[PDB]
Design a protein around this ligand. Sequence first.
Ligand SMILES: Cn1cc([C@@H]2O[C@H](COP(=O)(O)OP(=O)(O)OP(=O)(O)O)[C@@H](O)[C@H]2O)c(N)nc1=O
Ligand SMILES: [Mg+2]
Ligand SMILES: [Zn+2]
Ligand SMILES: [Zn+2]
Lengths: 99, 1052, 74
Amino acid sequence: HARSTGSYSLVTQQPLGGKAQFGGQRFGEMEVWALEAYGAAYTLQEMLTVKSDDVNGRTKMYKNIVDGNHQMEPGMPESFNVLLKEIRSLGINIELEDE
Amino acid sequence: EFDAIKIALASPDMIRSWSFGEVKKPETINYRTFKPERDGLFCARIFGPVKDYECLCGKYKRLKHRGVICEKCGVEVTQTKVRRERMGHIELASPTAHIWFLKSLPSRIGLLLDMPLRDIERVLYFEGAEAIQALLKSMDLEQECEQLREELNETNSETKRKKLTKRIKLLEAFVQSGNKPEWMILTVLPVLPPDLRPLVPLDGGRFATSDLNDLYRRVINRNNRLKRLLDLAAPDIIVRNEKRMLQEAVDALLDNGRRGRAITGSNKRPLKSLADMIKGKQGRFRQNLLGKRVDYSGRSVITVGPYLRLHQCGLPKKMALELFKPFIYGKLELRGLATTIKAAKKMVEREEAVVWDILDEVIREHPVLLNRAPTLHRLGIQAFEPVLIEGKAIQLHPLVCAAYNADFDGDQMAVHVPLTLEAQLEARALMMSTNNILSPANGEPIIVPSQDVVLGLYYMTRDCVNAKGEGMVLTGPKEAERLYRSGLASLHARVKVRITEYEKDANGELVAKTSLKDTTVGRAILWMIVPKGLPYSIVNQALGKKAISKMLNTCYRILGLKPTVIFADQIMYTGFAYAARSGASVGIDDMVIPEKKHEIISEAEAEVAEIQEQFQSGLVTAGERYNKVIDIWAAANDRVSKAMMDNLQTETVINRDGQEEKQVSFNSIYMMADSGARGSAAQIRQLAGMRGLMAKPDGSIIETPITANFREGLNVLQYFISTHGARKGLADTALKTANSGYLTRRLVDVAQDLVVTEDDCGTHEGIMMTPVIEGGDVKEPLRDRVLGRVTAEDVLKPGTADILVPRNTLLHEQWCDLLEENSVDAVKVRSVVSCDTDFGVCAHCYGRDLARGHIINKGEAIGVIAAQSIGEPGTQLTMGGLPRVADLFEARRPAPHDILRLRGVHAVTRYIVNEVQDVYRLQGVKINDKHIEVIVRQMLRKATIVNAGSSDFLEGEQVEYSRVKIANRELEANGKVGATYSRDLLGITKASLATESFISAASFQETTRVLTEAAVAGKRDELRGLKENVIVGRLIPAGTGYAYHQDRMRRR
Amino acid sequence: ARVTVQDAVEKIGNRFDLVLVAARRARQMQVGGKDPLVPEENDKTTVIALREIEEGLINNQILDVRERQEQQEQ
DNA sequence: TCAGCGAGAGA
RNA sequence: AUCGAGAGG
DNA sequence: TCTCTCGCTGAGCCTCTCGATG
Ligand SMILES: Cn1cc([C@@H]2O[C@H](COP(=O)(O)OP(=O)(O)OP(=O)(O)O)[C@@H](O)[C@H]2O)c(N)nc1=O
Ligand SMILES: [Mg+2]
Ligand SMILES: [Zn+2]
Ligand SMILES: [Zn+2]
């Protein structure tokens, strides 16, 4: 089985996970540990933003790869926003301190 | 666009500020039709348009009028994404308590008050919490703290001081945080956004529903039932009971199951609350933020490819054509073969010949990453150059298997594609297989031939007597090759050949020497692949596994890296080529049974009989014949095994010339065992000797052994006996993997933030190194323990006023040989445990890099490396013992505490290191002591204050060691008196939860209490560790990102 | 640039900064439209940059002065 | 289920 | 899209 | 001060298949 692009889950807009559903492979915690022990920061940042639940970054990255420019500008994942909204739902104030 | 995350308690005004809609009285979405009903949980007005740029009534549908609310229906036009952003609120009619601040072992909603938990619960259960709300409102914190401070001094009992300090700390923290009282009791409730709790359609008309929408509706109806009752002025008897029914309802939306009798739904399973969506293996932290599913990936079965070079792998073309789609689209657009995306997609789908050349050019110099699932160390992911093949399986290099722990009996593998220039360069420069030849856990090579290669090279270099072609004199290796390929000579003939070899002259210049040497044909043939610079004596013998490893290491040391990979590939080709030509096989007559066996057993059966006679008339204890019979059987088994090996090792007798002689035999099993390719001595014992003595399931020794082997088979009773051990081994393997995994995760969590940040800290302390001698046999010498360290002080020669060793020197192989030429003493070291660096370690206190050979660089994540290096052999052992090391690393009480208190950090360091190495060495596992020292340094990061001094303190004041040291250093130049502190020791699980960062502590485990303390303290997170930046999605402050972060602090 | 990169590591000093310099130099050729300093030989920008670094013609302080020259002219 | 460690008991 | 049952490395 | 009940906490990783009930 293999995949390049496809469909994403509804709440956490990450790829689905079955061959019958045309899903992607899972990059777990131990693989993150291995990349950290290598020191490959840009590969990890690719693995967490552009190939995952970041929405504008993957679109811009696809257009750039089509145009021949191998460069990414990442953003914030949606799962963090979901976690923040749930924490707010529990009656607790949590904030990103811009200052 | 941000640098910190702040957490604090919420207020009714903040909750109403977060909201877009009023109190939601309606209960249901609307089941009849798609349009939701107003004012309820799902609502078009509150949370925004259901469809992009279209109002619910449909009066406005298109852009230029955007930003204008419709008049007739009052609907704003906006993108539907806002439906996963906005929130709402429920305005209650009666106040309700928050279960989190009440339900805990240190209950903090009644910690400020003096009421016990039982009494507070009884008042709250009414057998609505206006009493609690008013009591918290009326309390004055400043006067209470002033009274408690005076009361603390008067008290002379240690037990009384324990509670007073806890109360004072909580009061002071609550005052300084800024959170007002009476906020732990709710008056408004927030509502989660709609699109994060959606309703999913089904094949039939019915829709799947979420648990949250049920609990919310239950709370809404139970709270709204009190709304109408207020106007009717019902008797207080009915009023009180409903209030309690409200309480539990709220305790349903919040953490469920914390007070017993968890609510359930249609099935017989409890419903999952909001607290269930944040913790556990299925929560957000451990399932969606520290790991996720990715694009540009694939999976398949793996097969061996024997023709590849070490930096290549074989990739199927059907997978590749789909993995690299956008690059093909772009290159198709570049050459004019298409004019649109749809045309290119159709052209790729209806595959032509032109697209295959495009695929050939896209992947010409593009690496890929391969990964095997269990992923125990960092070598479980590597990078390769892909070669397009036919079929469906993946081809893998034989030399990388042992690092992957892979064999070709059904294993699968995953593949990923880098996309940016930085990622491609990192893959080429850091993760390429040609870069990884030395272990990070020790200093041993990770590529090593085995099995058929070893057997082929061993057979190629053996020696016989009176073989064909013996006695010739040759001009060189080419004449030997010609004679062997013609058919005029044997590989095992003893001859004289003229050989030339090169050596280092004085500065790396190769100088040649030529002579005559007695050797064999095969050795001279093999000499043609050895690189220039190595002596001839390294192949003039029978080459086993260890000899081949030694050859590879010598070539790496003398000549470097580039010749080494070529030498390895040539060795693999030669071994595979010459294993096939021998026709080595296995047959039933290879397993030879000694002739005297039938004697040794029989006489033994006599002796066991004789002691039985001694049991007829009382002469020996009935508990003594057991031992004597067991000893007799052990001696008999030893005799039989010795006879078998003595017959098998010299089984060949040879007629040299009219005379007989003995030589090493050519029996297949014996050569397979001797060369080191497959098979230990005990397995040969079982195959052709005696099976031995078994054990009962309890652990006792069964008196009668198995006198048969696997050649002459077993009967029913012996076979039945031998099943207990097999089942016990399989059960032990099946159930102890989880313990190793849990220990590894704990070790990774305790040390994930340690990074090399400087070069020299300036300290002068250290650890004295001495050889480990116990009982009389030196278990550990005094050479390997100090290889690669840095001397803390000057080392003196065995004489007055003599300095044997220069300071700050880095000991390498040549230096080690020079030292061992006249070694008379030992060397002190600097340890990472004794390092004055703040927030990290310095290079000279660490040492050299085991993977590379030189001094450790800046930006290394040595903590993760230590954690993997320790956790890998424990897991690999699975598929005293593990409980012993888990008991040490958790600081379990039987003591290390007294060791630290009485002899410093050296005592605990020595105790833990020695007691871990004792367990690990019994299994023959090699791990350097640096990693254990890293973990121990992480195990002690807290100090207990005693004397306040001139700085701020709170008597006990368990604080960070680094912060106390910083305060003492700051209050030194100005002139003052510092504080007094003692060092504490903690277990890894306890040490992980007491960290300055609450995000990582919440990520580890026990989310609820960590979040409770953080919310009541008003903590602030600075995003300094690896895990925090992983969770937020930024470059980690290590490796290729390190400089980036150093730029950031230079911008402020 | 091919099979092994050890020479460029020795010429720059460590792998982490070598990656950054190589990426910065490769982006100039790929996107900014700049000519190579070696025969191209049907190679990608990454390996071309690695070869130029191994030859000694490219390092960080060279890419500083070269860019400073362009700013003055413009 | 089974350890592990507080927390709250008392003679 | 969970809940039970098995299977592979 | 020194035993004795009383309790929430935690328990390896990645794939595949079926049915029943939403
Ligand atoms: C059952 N299981 C198996 C594995 C993985 O499977 C590998 C061996 O599985 P295997 O089929 O190749 O058999 P093995 O090589 O040991 O012996 P034979 O080839 O028969 O001689 C083993 O390394 C291990 O990582 C795991 N991580 N968890 C499990 O629960
Ligand atoms: Mg296998
Ligand atoms: Zn409208
Ligand atoms: Zn230091």
